[PDB]
Amino acid sequence: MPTPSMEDYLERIYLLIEEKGYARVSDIAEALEVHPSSVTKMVQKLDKSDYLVYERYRGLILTAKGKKIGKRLVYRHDLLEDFLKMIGVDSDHIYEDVEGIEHHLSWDAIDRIGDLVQYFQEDPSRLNDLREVQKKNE
Amino acid sequence: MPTPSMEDYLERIYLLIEEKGYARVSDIAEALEVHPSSVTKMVQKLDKSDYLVYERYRGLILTAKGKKIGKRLVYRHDLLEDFLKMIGVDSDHIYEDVEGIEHHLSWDAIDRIGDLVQYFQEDPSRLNDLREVQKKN
């Protein structure tokens, strides 16, 4: 039920607390280069749905459900980037490819990509076999 | 240069042409589930910039530019469809995953996914191994 942008907010809030222990509306407005009123509008939508609370002095605080979602999105990002690096996407394209597909994949496809990323590591000579296919095509 | 919308039209037009020599506007409207009036507007944009021509009592033909683009777009859709099947996405989310992602991947990524699909075709025991990682979970 959360929109993609709502997920992006919860992940960004989780990562602000990872960075300095607190998440501020001004932090998000500055990182996004948007007006703080659009951040407070999004925060209100996340509050109303019990993904976070706000207290004056402590700032934005994730609920159990909000923190569950934020962490999952960090992991999905890490997983998709592992995948694209494994198959050889160059450093010019990999960041926007990860951002591009992370909200347009079913969790089924995310899980299947996870199995793929695990497969190339359980016997890492699989990765060298893959690199050789790419070399042969050049 | 071609927008996502243009690409969606070019890909469908190429599929009809490769199958029937010409793409009819009526077939394009039903396939894309848009009103014929929207197709007409898109056709005039593509005609004016030389992606296609309209031939009376036949339909649309792609120019060399339009054809080279529509071919590459069909390849991308087919490769992503193959890639998702191969890694075990259920058949009842495949269509939605392909359309959700096809406008969001560099051609660099498409090429590498091609190399990946090729890796699994050159030795079909690789796919059996992949399946054992997934059933073990």
Residue numbers in the entry:
A (entry chain A): 1 to 138
B (entry chain B): 1 to 137
How did the manuscript describe this experimental structure?
The manganese transport regulator (MntR) functions as a homodimer and is activated by Mn2+ to repress the expression of two manganese uptake systems, MntABCD and MntH, in response to elevated concentrations of Mn2+. The MntR homologue (BH2807, BhMntR) in Bacillus halodurans is a protein consisting of 139 amino acids, and has 78% sequence identity with MntR from B.subtilis (BsMntR). Each BhMntR subunit was composed of seven α-helices and two β-strands, which could be divided into an N-terminal Helix-Turn-Helix (HTH) DNA binding domain (domain1, residues 1–71) and a C-terminal dimerization domain (domain2, residues 72–139). To further understand the metal binding site of the MntR protein, we determined crystal structures of the apo and manganese-bound forms of MntR from B. halodurans.
The structure was refined to crystallographic Rwork and Rfree values of 18.9% and 22.9%, respectively with good geometry. The C-terminal region of chains A (residue 139) and B (residues 136–139) were poorly ordered, due to lack of electron-density maps. There were few structural differences between apo and Mn2+-bound dimeric forms, with a r.m.s.d. value of 0.49 Å for 276 Cα atoms. When measured between the Cα atoms of Lys41, at the center of helix α3, the domain separation of apo and manganese bound BhMntR are 37.4 Å and 37.5 Å, respectively, while the distance between the Lys41 in apo, Mn2+-bound, and Zn2+-bound BsMntR are 39.2 Å, 32.1Å and 30.7Å, respectively. There was little domain movement between apo and Mn2+-bound BhMntR, possibly due to crystal packing or the presence of positively charged ions of Na+ (~0.5 M) and Mg2+ (~0.4 M) during the crystallization process.
